[PDB]
Amino acid sequence: AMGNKLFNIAQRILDTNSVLLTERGDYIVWINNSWKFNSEEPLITKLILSIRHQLPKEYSSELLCPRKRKTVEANIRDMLVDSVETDTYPDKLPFKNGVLDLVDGMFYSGDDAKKYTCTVSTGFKFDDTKFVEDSPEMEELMNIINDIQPLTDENKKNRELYEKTLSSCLCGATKGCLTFFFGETATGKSTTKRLLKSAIGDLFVETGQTILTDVLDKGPNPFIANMHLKRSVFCSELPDFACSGSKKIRSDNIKKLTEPCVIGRPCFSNKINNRNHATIIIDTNYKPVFDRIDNALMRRIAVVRFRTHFSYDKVKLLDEGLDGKIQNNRYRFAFLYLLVKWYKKYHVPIMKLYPTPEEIPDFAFYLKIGTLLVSSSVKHIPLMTDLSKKGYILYDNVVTLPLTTFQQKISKYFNSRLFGHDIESFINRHKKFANVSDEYLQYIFIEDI
Amino acid sequence: AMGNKLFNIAQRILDTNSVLLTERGDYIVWINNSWKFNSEEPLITKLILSIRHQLPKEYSSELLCPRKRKTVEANIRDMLVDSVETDTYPDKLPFKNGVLDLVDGMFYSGDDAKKYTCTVSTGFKFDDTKFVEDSPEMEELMNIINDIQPLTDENKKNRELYEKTLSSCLCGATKGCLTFFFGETATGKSTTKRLLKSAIGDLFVETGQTILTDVLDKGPNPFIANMHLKRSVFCSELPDFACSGSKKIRSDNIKKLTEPCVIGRPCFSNKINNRNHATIIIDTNYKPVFDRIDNALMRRIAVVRFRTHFSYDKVKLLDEGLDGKIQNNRYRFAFLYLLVKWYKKYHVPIMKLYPTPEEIPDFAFYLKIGTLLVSSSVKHIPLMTDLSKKGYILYDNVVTLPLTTFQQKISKYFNSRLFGHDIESFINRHKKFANVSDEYLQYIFIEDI
Amino acid sequence: AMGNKLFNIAQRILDTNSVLLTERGDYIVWINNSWKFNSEEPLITKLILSIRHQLPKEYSSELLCPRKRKTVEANIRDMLVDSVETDTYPDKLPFKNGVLDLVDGMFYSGDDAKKYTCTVSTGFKFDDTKFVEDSPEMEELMNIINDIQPLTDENKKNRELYEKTLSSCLCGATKGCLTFFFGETATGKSTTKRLLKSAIGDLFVETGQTILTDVLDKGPNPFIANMHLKRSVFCSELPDFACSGSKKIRSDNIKKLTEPCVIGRPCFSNKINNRNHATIIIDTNYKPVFDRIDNALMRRIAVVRFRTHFSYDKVKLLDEGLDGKIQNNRYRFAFLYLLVKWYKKYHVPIMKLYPTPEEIPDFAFYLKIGTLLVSSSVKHIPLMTDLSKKGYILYDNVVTLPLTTFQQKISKYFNSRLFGHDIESFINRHKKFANVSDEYLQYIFIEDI
Amino acid sequence: AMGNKLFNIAQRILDTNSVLLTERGDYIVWINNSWKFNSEEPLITKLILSIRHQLPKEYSSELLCPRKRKTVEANIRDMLVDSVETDTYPDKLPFKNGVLDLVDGMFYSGDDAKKYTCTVSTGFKFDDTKFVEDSPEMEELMNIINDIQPLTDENKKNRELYEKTLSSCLCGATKGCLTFFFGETATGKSTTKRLLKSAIGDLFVETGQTILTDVLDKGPNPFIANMHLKRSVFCSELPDFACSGSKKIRSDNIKKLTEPCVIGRPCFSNKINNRNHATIIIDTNYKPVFDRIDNALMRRIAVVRFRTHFSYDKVKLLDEGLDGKIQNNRYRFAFLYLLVKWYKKYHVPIMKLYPTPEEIPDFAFYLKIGTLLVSSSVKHIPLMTDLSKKGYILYDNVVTLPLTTFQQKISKYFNSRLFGHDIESFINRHKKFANVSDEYLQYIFIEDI
């Protein structure tokens, strides 16, 4: 003994596509020009109460009743079967008033933004009037950024990489190459972090050294749970790697947070499948030291140096009143305009994240090795005719070089006194013993091919 | 004071067999040509709302009411008594549009797929138009795979085993022999993993070294919980086994993940009985080192080597743009067609997984021992007439060989300098002491029978 | 089959804005001139029962029914969509009778206080009659405070900083500089803590050494959960830092509790985003010793010394009966008046928290270093023409000073015998090796520019 | 479609103030002359069913219905807004028949006790007939107590302190000074504990060494949760402090359980704010040894010695049948009368708890130090004219005494052989080094002022 019109109301509600079912089995609603979502309290009832006005008068009176409204909510829940995924596009930026595009830079609102289904938003209302380049705040922030990173040819590559990383912080896609902020304390890294956080609102997230030094997938992991559906990750607090007791940046962790779907359990929920749209920028004051080094990690890591102090490459005075404007979001829209311009300059139309392993001594050593230490293969076997008199003894049909000769030759190209531990670790990892003592390495110099 | 027609509606719904009760006490529904299932929210109400159209007009109006719909759902729950198990067949591949067969290669959809009850699906809609061999993507992917594994007689066995393992990744049956991917970094293992994951969608799963180096059944285990009802398991991140601190591949774990029903507790649920349909491929860069070695493990382990680098057996240049096509699923259906062809070539009509222990030095040593070190028995007792003058002293009615003689003879067939630790461990594990010092081993050479 | 007038009642209730939805997804109500809030039991029903009197007679009779009242509560929950944040203003002090302003010192009540949405309150009813300067309690408490901190020129800076910190305890904004209470046992720190707690009621909170010596974000953290939305944090029980086993004040923790939004998980709830409005005063009896020292921490730390004992700078007799008046809140409103006067004197109109690192020997050493040890840069490279004969050898295009020369010169300005460990730690942290032994530091004296 | 009279019934119920809302958000009821309270099951329905008799006949018939009774309960819950706190008075003792006053010694019952809102009760019905001094049980118990503590001038102070502590066990206020029971095994401490427990019923609580030797605020803490709203805490089982492995009585814990509101988390509930009305008596057999010693702790600790054994100051025979009478509560009301008389003698009208640190050798040493070792100050600087020739060298404008002179002088007043460890710890804690070796202490003898 119930009503029949309520199913028609539910069908009309589903016609507008104002409520969608996520791939995680959660229901989202489109209210106040924003895809609001809440797993704890279902927002379907609020959606119905909101959109009662967009329906004929014969239905709003029916929807005024909470019993009938819950009935319509149940009907909508039954009708939503296809678990349509959301947040597909990486080139759209959601706001509290709509969605701002990164391709053309135009801001959408209302039903134009409704075409996009964003799980989150920037956390503040968009303002085109404040989103203009012709403003004193824009010039002030441009000068501040140029102080942080000079527009000099010596810093040209570093400045360009810094701009590319800050622009990629906008993109809602998987990060292809981790980025590091190298320098000293208060060299511009913290100011950049604060400006980016103020610009992107709730999309920003900050964390410590846990994800870089500890195991991620072990029971609950609130850090990874919060990092999901984010736009940028800032990892500060890195320890003195030379000093004892400081954990290394685990390459397993780096390979873990470089995938579209990163595992990790949230708190009292099943959300292990996490979408990773965040540009992870690591704030540190020392040169990074890792546990495992290989070509994949060297292609996964970019380094942005900071060489300008504010009491290096340039020394200026401290601006104590700068932080107050950042906390008041004075340079929020100016920084957003700068980020949009950088995205248009670099990442439009294709996202690009190229590594800079040459900025790390360990990765530079490994690259200079891999260039001159190509691994032996079947194609290298016919080189024995010339390598027999060059010290290469053929062991197990592999061109093998004696350890003593390998060390005497690697001391010629690398500073053995500076690279002592690195050479020792490379030898201990990549050497093979003939019987007990005739230790050899299966790598051939270019000068011997 | 309720209705009587609702029970008739429930009986009609159960006539179509659109809702089934699993062996785990969970209810599945058949909506949108897919066996959708959800333990959190019962999908029976959605099933009724969907199939109201497949019923006379006198019943759809009744079903429009959520109260009566919940009543029908309760009736269906009461009527479902026989806990019919699902996912029986290993030769069927489920899709978002139906089920693709591996016997004939024909794709079923609609009620044809409804005959099959698949707990999961590949996670994407099937497309026969893209599932064709006559396509440029197929040729490109064939060339890429041939680069990863050449079609050479020297690599013929390795390539054939690699194809067999990738085809067995499709089969929804228990794995009979674990498979290893041996090589260096970025030798083709990661590309194969990405291609297989893109091809099989949600059926793919990836994990670390925990299941291979740690204890599985200890409280909650989300890894095993996710691995259930899967088609393939990829285990990357294996440590340098020669270096200290790196755990060994526990043979107990290997024997644990080689059964149709593998124990392991999920998170806040009772699903310890897990169906294992996954082909576990282990990505590593070193030769594996285990904790326990025996004939069962040697028959449980297959090794697929990778001998082609992309800057070995062949060295080529790097294709940086290859990963973008994989992430865009350009070679998804081409890889699926290749997998289907391999399954037809090898696993049709009978699944076969034969071990290759000869690719591991430890297993090769153990096999060469077991051939020449047959254990003494009652049948070997009458050999004493000839073995008394051959050094075999009869102890406890067992043909016993002195430890010194055993070592002096095992040094003849095995390189003692290379196999020092292996011989020492075998002696310490399989020797017996006569009184305190006349240590003997209960094994006889073939040259002495 | 329900009523239509109930939605009109809900609309009238929402017209008064007596119920708001927080950013945390929680509902607050305005009853008895106070923004009462409870996550466990929804107070909306109580709000409706209270404000039935502020509605026409045709609606109070409807609201007398708990069924209709729950219906109206559901309607209000549906109508509350915009998650309006609360506790914006830092210059307003909430009471059980209203809100007391810090700008003009006038107390608001009723609808005047309703304009302000305070999550918490001082926990006691305001009394303007007791909030007067012309009272014997005010003079007694002024004399007591002057005994605790004399109004002498030698103590002028310390007394002024103490007053500024106690006034900032009122402000509901983020703390910009941590404050320390240094002295001996019962030198006035405990009396100040008790007086401040009695003055500010529930806004006060006290904790131990856990947040200063341990990791905050690790699972549940009831300390941080209680510290949220607070006005002041008192950290007593600091250990003897010279003695072994005593943990150092972690600079990571200090940087953690200096942000408007501090992470940390509560008990069985999702409230990791915590608003930090608390002035953290650390009660200690020793000079602090930290794990990491830098300019940011030196700008984050202020020190208030206590130099007057009550049996230093002054010694008096003990007042045993003082604590009884504090526990009876005799000097509650007098201390509140003093705090308001201090806030008007210092923090009106702008909150200011300036560090005093010169009160810590470690920070004084670091400041005297950083003044005379400016780091080398590109601008310092052209100084080589004069620094070549001054001992500065150019290494890697950096002005480098030998370690022996650096030590022989740092012994001239700092007492090496007193600063032995500090100099050793600074050398071990900031030195670089040329090859193996020619250790250098990249810092230049002012006398050499 | 409900009734209107039910709200009138709820208003009449709230008129009697038979149900109150606690500060913890819990509801209490007044049934059977007792403020019964239960967080698990709301007792409001039972209260309504009980007080239906105190209402006109037109309302009891309405209240007979459980549906209408639950409706009235909901109305009462809505009407209870002001979270009135309970258990204010420290001078009232609750019983199962009412409340017994400590000021005049008169027992209240019915509505007279209803004026008082006690969270707990003594757990047994009061009996004025058994609450008389003229009874053989009173004389027997007086003789037993005099055996436990003689009425001798040598024991006069100890007996008086023991009586004061036992009387303060009645007071429902915060303890101002911790009390210790010192002696040997079965010297009267256990008998006193049993008698007090039998006298005060459920108000008594007993615990081990955890709260005195471990950290309180670490997750759940059922000990502190049970100790809340109690009248006395007995801590037995103290270990041999001289032996290794025995934890010290943490002064941090002592300062923690000496506040009206003591933190500590209960089990699966939010009751961290705990009211501490309990007199904590510590049962031990050794002299206490602490981790931190200062004037605050010396003023926080009282010691009651036991010097009469029952096979010291007196030795008698064992009364084996004494415990049976205690377990049968024969001396319950006699002990209650004795406690009331002691409260009238000492704590009426003002609660007093004065420390006795002279009973502990460590505290006696510290007091004798602090008398003769007044810390140097600015007022002590002008004493340099006479202290320059007395060995006091002026360092950093502080009167400093050499360590060798300090030791040679402290050996004159204290037995250095007995106080070796104490003097060593005091030196290691309170000394300062001039440069590396000229160690000094900033304390001046009285003989030098």
Residue numbers in the entry:
A (entry chain B), B (entry chain A), C (entry chain C), D (entry chain D): 321 to 631, 645 to 782
The authors write:
The helicase-primase D5, composed of six identical 90 kDa subunits, is required for DNA replication. As the ribonucleotide hydrolase activity of D5323–785 had also been indistinguishable from D5fl, we used the D5323–785 construct for high-resolution work, assisted by an Alphafold2 prediction, which yielded a structure of D5 with a high reliability index and allowed us to assign five domains: the primase domain and a distinct Zn-binding (or Cys-cluster) domain in the N-terminal polypeptide not present in D5323–785 used for cryo-EM reconstruction, a collar domain, an AAA+ helicase domain, and a C-terminal domain. The sample used for the cryo-EM data collection contained a roughly equimolar complex of D5323–785 hexamer with a dsDNA 30-mer obtained by mixing.
